[PDB]
Amino acid sequence: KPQIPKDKSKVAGYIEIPDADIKEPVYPGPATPEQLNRGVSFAEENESLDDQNISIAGHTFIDRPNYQFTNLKAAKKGSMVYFKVGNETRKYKMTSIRDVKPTDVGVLDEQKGKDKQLTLITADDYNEKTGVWEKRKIFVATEVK
């Protein structure tokens, strides 16, 4: 089964969202500033490609409109999302849970039902004291299967 590298400097996959012109290599988590400096990365260090919900975080940087997840808001309901691993191209469609604040604006959409999903997180303003990206917006995509 698809495995995420132990070496944090090695690419684990590729994520693409055509409608938003996003094409990025995905690195192992957790998503710290160093990891996001490398590219978008898995949310948690213990993430698994066999999980029902796979989370990937990406930066928002206005100096570079098409950098990582800066242009993710351009991906509306129904937008195709491609997650490429070594042996498969997984396809997902953006749901109505998009561009929403992590808490109270939106929550568990399919984390338990309706199948496999990808949770894309735009991250900004990392707080070293708490280990949290204070500025976050989530986008949930469900597998086309």
């Binding site: 998503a31 996001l36 949310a43 948690e44 989370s55 975080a57 992590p102 808490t103 939106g106 929550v107 568990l108 984390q111 949770t119 997180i121 735009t122 991250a123 949290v132 990206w133 976050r136 989530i138």
Partner: peptide, 5 residues
């Protein structure tokens, strides 16, 4: 949880 980054 939804998650964080």
């Amino acid at each position: 949880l939804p998650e964080t980054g």
